[PDB]
Amino acid sequence: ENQIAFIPKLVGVGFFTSGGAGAVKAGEEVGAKVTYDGPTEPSVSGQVQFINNFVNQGYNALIVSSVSPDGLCPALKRAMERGVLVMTWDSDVNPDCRSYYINQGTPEQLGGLLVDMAAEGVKKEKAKVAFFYSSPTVTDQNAWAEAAKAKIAKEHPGWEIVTTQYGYNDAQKSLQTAESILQTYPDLDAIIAPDANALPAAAQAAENLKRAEGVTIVGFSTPNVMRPYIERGTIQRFGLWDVTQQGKISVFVADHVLKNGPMKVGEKLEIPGVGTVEVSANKVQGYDYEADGNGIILLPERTVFTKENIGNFDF
Template sequence: MKKSILFVLVVSLVFSVAVFANGAGDSGKDAADIEVVFIPKLTGNMFFESANVGAQDIAAKVGFTCTYDGSPNASVADQVQIINSAVARGVDAISISSLTPDGLNDALKKAQDNGIKVVTWDSDVDPMYRELYVNQGTPEILGKLLVDMAADQMTDSQKASAKFAFFYSSPTVTDQNAWVEYAKVYIGENYPGWELLTTEYGEQDAQKSFQIGQSILDTYSDLDAILCPDSTALPGMAEAARRANLTKDDIIITGFATPSSMREYLKDNTIEAFGLWDCGLQGAMGAYLAYWLALGNTFSVGDSIDIPGIGSVKVESNDIQGYKNAPKDTGIVLLPERVVFTTANVDDYNF
């Protein structure tokens, strides 16, 4: 059974015994009274569209309204406008994947000042401007995974002296830069002979990512590996390699993207492996936790929160993401697992 279909069935089956496991909260509102605005980095990207499927599924089961509101462009200004519009409409909660670590601060502060609960998912903001962050993995978890997926494909000679590149969305996006910074630390500790030749950015634009992928191949013909921790950069890089008639035997390309966007590149031997997490699950958790807070529920670090169809999730300290002096009434919820996709398992997933 396809994994995203399985998730929907599990939500349906468990819902009958798990609804409102944490009570109705103190807001005096019922589920039908709550509106959560669910904001991606951009629309049209399979990662964020899949996250929205998870968000809409759980909203329908629980009974709250989840409004998907995003821009087709990866624009901080557009995210600010969407937040301001949500504030003007008087919504109850915002759940957002931020394009910037600090560019949304003023807009989110205005939302909080108007009683709107803020949750981040996928990519965070300063903990001062949100209550919870639904995190796909700490920088240590994902930075290590990114490097290991490349190293596992290398010969002993390559492991000793690989030349590599990073290619992802931008120099300012919170999540990907944190993963890359830890990846550099991990490489220094475990593969000191590796040489970083370039770091390139595709701005989460599909055509630009393809063109930059071509440029990387043209400029750095001696690369052993290209690490792409971005769901737009990775397929763009793979397409550039395919059009150059390069296969996984010629160059290692790996990173994070959805199975649906990368399946064909696995099957035609352009790449050998890539990774991700269940973005539908992440979307469901991001939407539900925003709703749960809007009901008036509160938490402390170390508490567990029951999510219908998903189970109990623990609120971790902001310290696991490297934050210092974060507000005590904020925290992080981690996704339970990450997945490495190969030809052996990619058809088990349909997001």
């Protein structure tokens, strides 16, 4: 059977654990050997070492959520020149460095979701807002944050973005950053935290400092991590998408391409228990690059979690 590596930014974070579980399950469904493995720290070096290991083992495909737009390119290009299928999921690399990106949404959809969620709680024309996510280099979150900032400048001209700070996919660093944000900005109105670790850290610090009544806190994380904060009312809402299914889609697409050849832009793949996915042009993500057998496969939906529906999810 095909050997397929599914690599997160780092392990030990619910988002990535859940994605990997979907990938591993799909392997069993589709008849492929799927290995979920990755570094304990979100480093370029760590990801490159795992990439090199799977390539050296003669794996047929790898699907990675990248901590960097370009840092993985040499390793991934080495992979592709040896006939290894290279794909990304969650966070992309430069399009000439992979084939397909299994993508939860466009920067506009996701940036727009962040802003809309924040706007629901701010309900004030003049406001002070902080951005808080993993790192200034990571592909996905910076794309979304840039799109969100652009929307804020246009839709909410009275909002002042007072700071952008980073938690580095780390509970302790994120906790310190969140407490620092709150203490520096006593009149802060919102925190937009598009990162699985940053969001719960912001919620926690707000509870620690009794700041939750005044700061609207939104972002992207998993239900199992955010549950306590939603149930207590510390935050009202946050977003994500079906990351388990995202992992499944990645594996099915990989296995299809291995068995049947490259998909082209416009082409569709039927996936049992999922539906139909389609290859979009890189243009949908804002890239200026196209090539045969290269593109972006968008997830069907994003979800907003509140106390009303969080009980319906377990990941």
